[PDB]
Design a protein around this ligand. Structure first.
Ligand SMILES: CCCCCC(=O)OC[C@H](COP(=O)(O)OC[C@H](N)C(=O)O)OC(=O)CCCCC
Ligand SMILES: CCCCCC(=O)OC[C@H](COP(=O)(O)OC[C@H](N)C(=O)O)OC(=O)CCCCC
Ligand SMILES: CCCCCC(=O)OC[C@H](COP(=O)(O)OC[C@H](N)C(=O)O)OC(=O)CCCCC
Ligand SMILES: *[C@@H]1O[C@H](CO)[C@@H](O)[C@H](O)[C@H]1NC(C)=O
Ligand SMILES: *[C@@H]1O[C@H](CO)[C@@H](O)[C@H](O)[C@H]1NC(C)=O
Ligand SMILES: *[C@@H]1O[C@H](CO)[C@@H](O)[C@H](O)[C@H]1NC(C)=O
Ligand SMILES: *[C@@H]1O[C@H](CO)[C@@H](O)[C@H](O)[C@H]1NC(C)=O
Ligand SMILES: *[C@@H]1O[C@H](CO)[C@@H](O)[C@H](O)[C@H]1NC(C)=O
Ligand SMILES: *[C@@H]1O[C@H](CO)[C@@H](O)[C@H](O)[C@H]1NC(C)=O
Lengths: 107, 109, 109, 107, 105, 106
């Protein structure tokens, strides 16, 4: 369950490697454990345009489906952003965990 | 119904998330709901849906739409008591409208 | 003031957040604040066409791209050397005035 | 010469190589590992599309020929990735070293 | 011949690199040893990235980077053998790689 | 005027900034004063301005997005020293962008 450390007021990049054949054709999402893991942002609904950056407030997501890497950007990282999060692979109504991330905010 | 509060004289930003695939191609509106009952148009996104990013104004209220992320943003520039109220974020189609969000704008002195 | 540090000889990525509505429609610049609150000297600016702000512009060993939807300006100092150390400003241009978005100390390890 | 890049294990590491854009105008580039240096990945065969990201396994490369920067991404960096590498500029059968790089990995 | 070995009842991913300019426009095929076709990439070469199936074997092609990927799903001892990656042009088929697939229980 | 100084025998790189909007669509030239004799111009197709053009051991290339014109003086000699112009062409005329003084040393 990986640790990503960032400087406060700067953009923190979170990277989630995944098996690109096993998760072929699947949309991804980023969520924050609140309890339940609640949806922050997801990749483009059109899987062939997953490379396109999608924003939700101060979080962005982009997916490189060929290389099998999902990147999340926490813009303007604030101490209130520290906590547990998940990269997930979507399919049907299910979500599989690609990676569990702890975010920490320095100073 | 979610409350958005801001101080008088400062910009208040209201956000309405929406499912961007479901609302693909649909213009959006911000309107004042008096009654259960008349919904009065304040401002709408550009007539050309590919230009929905363009910031459109009525008086001191602005609206822009990020159609890719699925976020409508309404800005109430110099928030005053007469802005307080119940509002709708709507998705337009024909002369119909679906309600994306109900918002209460409150003003703090 | 926020501090970004990097290793000499490698690229250093600086990012400046801003309010995308407040500075809607504006070009950005990165400049070096050469002493006092005296001369802030232009290093690089975003594309002359605001709708093309996402295109990387180079001046010398500095690049810039703006994400006007997320409200984040990104500056790349290629091949960072001790001479690049110092105080800089991300700015928003309007008319021929400039507002400071953020002050950045570049430190070189 | 040799520059050092450290990155954390299980996260993506970005290596950058500056070069002179006039001196290497028109040339393709490559990234290789010292074991002599074995090719890991090269830039697009069409020089005008050097900006396009190319993968080979867990390594990617892209070239900004205007700015004179070659970027190499080591995805899901593993302790076995530690070692010595070169950025090179290709002309006919010859490969000029742009930079020697040491990759270190951490906890 | 390169050797690819996988645990039985799991996915084995075989990779065949090739020169992307040299094989520009060419579909590929995965064949078993005469070589008997198992699966080939999409008829429309601009969709070579699409995964095509024959039973539990898949094929997908990255024509930009020059990597052909064959996946053998739920690998079994009866998948063990000698196979070919090929590049089709006309009714010709040129050998890109010989691959030895081996299974462990 | 701006001075670019390079050591004998090595390539010297002269850069000329310009406003890319103002000079949109226009070819550029490097010319040498004695009256200014033209040495090399950017490609006749402006969309191909990035193309390194030559005349002997002088190269010209233009970045029309950033507004940076780049002249290369390869194998620099003592006689390459003196006065030059970066110019922007339009119809018959030629606006000056920068006057460049090149000094050598060894
Ligand atoms: C840089 C090259 C990429 C091409 C850039 C490009 O095409 O813009 C992407 C758009 C942006 O998405 P929408 O604004 O439609 O939102 C709704 C959307 N359903 C969503 O999930 O966000 O997506 C399309 O649906 C385009 C259709 C055809 C495109 C070929
Ligand atoms: C995204 C913006 C620009 C995108 C540019 C674009 O239009 O397509 C990208 C392709 C990539 O080609 P391949 O990588 O499949 O071919 C293998 C290759 N020979 C190699 O070395 O990898 O370039 C061409 O060969 C066709 C030229 C078309 C003219 C543009
Ligand atoms: C990759 C996605 C879109 C990419 C947009 C695109 O197609 O071209 C990029 C150019 C930038 O390059 P120029 O060398 O022409 O710089 C001149 C510089 N623009 C200046 O003004 O200083 O934009 C335009 O001029 C406007 C035409 C494009 C209109 C869409
Ligand atoms: C953005 O994230 C918040 C959770 O903090 C959520 O309420 C909202 O629906 C999200 N918006 C989109 C478009 O996914
Ligand atoms: C501005 O909004 C008011 C409702 O508050 C409405 O009467 C008027 O028509 C609107 N103006 C425009 C230009 O839509
Ligand atoms: C690049 O810097 C020079 C000053 O060195 C200046 O004339 C030019 O305008 C700059 N370019 C941009 C894009 O700001
Ligand atoms: C990928 O790596 C393999 C062997 O390590 C090689 O055969 C292939 O050509 C490489 N690809 C590139 C694009 O250099
Ligand atoms: C699927 O596999 C078998 C050989 O393993 C082959 O005989 C059959 O024809 C294949 N299907 C196609 C469409 O080639
Ligand atoms: C090249 O530049 C020289 C400078 O000696 C000039 O005299 C000549 O006319 C130019 N001609 C060609 C063909 O490049």
């Amino acid at each position: 369950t990986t640790v990503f450390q960032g400087v406060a007021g700067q953009s923190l990049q979170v990277s989630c490697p995944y098996d690109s054949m096993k998760h072929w054709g699947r949309r991804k999402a980023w969520c924050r454990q609140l309890g339940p893991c609640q949806r922050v942002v997801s990749t483009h609904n059109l899987w062939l345009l997953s490379f396109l950056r999608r924003w939700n407030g101060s979080t962005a997501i982009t997916d490189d489906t060929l290389g099998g890497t999902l990147t999340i950007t926490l813009r303007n990282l604030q101490p209130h952003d520290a906590g547990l999060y998940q990269c997930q692979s979507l399919h049907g109504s299910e979500a599989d965990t690609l990676r569990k991330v702890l975010v920490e905010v320095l100073a």
